[PDB]
């Protein structure tokens, strides 16, 4: 399956460590795992998109 | 150093897989790594808080 697009307001860049980081520009919030839109999906039970799964 | 608080609008819960997930309630956006407020820090050069570093 293709990489899911980022949700609105987010951008992917690369940190000097060589790892990608994801910035929500307006809130200045960063995460080191690709964020995605859950929508009406179940937070506890949904299957995450492959591009967003962390190690494990 | 203590765990950094989540930014506004975010909540940590646990996915059925046993891993934590972080939900921004209003946008329905999820990430699997703890988000944090970067503020005036440099996106490329800042040192991330320990609780937000992914595997590696």
Author numbering:
A (entry chain A), B (entry chain A): 300 to 355
Direct quotes from the study:
Human DGCR8 is composed of an N-terminal region that is required for nuclear localization, a central heme-binding domain (HBD, residues 276–498), two double-stranded RNA-binding domains (dsRBDs, residues 500–700) and a C-terminal tail (CTT, residues 701–751). The HBD is a dimer and each HBD dimer binds one heme molecule. The HBD coordinates the heme Fe(III) using two thiol/thiolate groups from the highly-conserved Cys352 residues contributed by both subunits. The dimerization domain is an integral part of the heme-binding domain in human DGCR8; it aligns residues important for heme-binding in proper spatial positions.
We present the crystal structure of the frog (X. laevis) DGCR8 dimerization domain. Crystallographic refinement was performed using a model containing DGCR8 residues 300–355 and water molecules, and resulted in final R and Rfree factors of 0.2068 and 0.2280, respectively. Thus, our crystals contained the dimerization domain generated through degradation of the HBD. The frog dimerization domain crystal contains a single polypeptide chain in the asymmetric unit. The chain forms a dimer via a crystallographic twofold symmetry. After strand β3, the polypeptide chain extends through a hinge loop into a fourth β-strand (β4) that interacts with the WW motif of the partner subunit, forming a continuous β-sheet and resulting in an apparently domain-swapped dimer. All DGCR8 residues known to be important for heme binding, including Pro351, Cys352 and Trp329, cluster on a common surface. The dimerization domain structure of frog DGCR8 is very similar to that of human DGCR8 with some differences at the N- and C-termini. In the structural superimposition, the side chain of frog Cys354 points toward a direction distinct from that of human Cys352, as supported by a relatively weak but substantial electron density. Overall, the high degree of sequence and structural conservation suggests that frog DGCR8 uses the same mechanism of dimerization to aid heme binding as identified in human DGCR8.
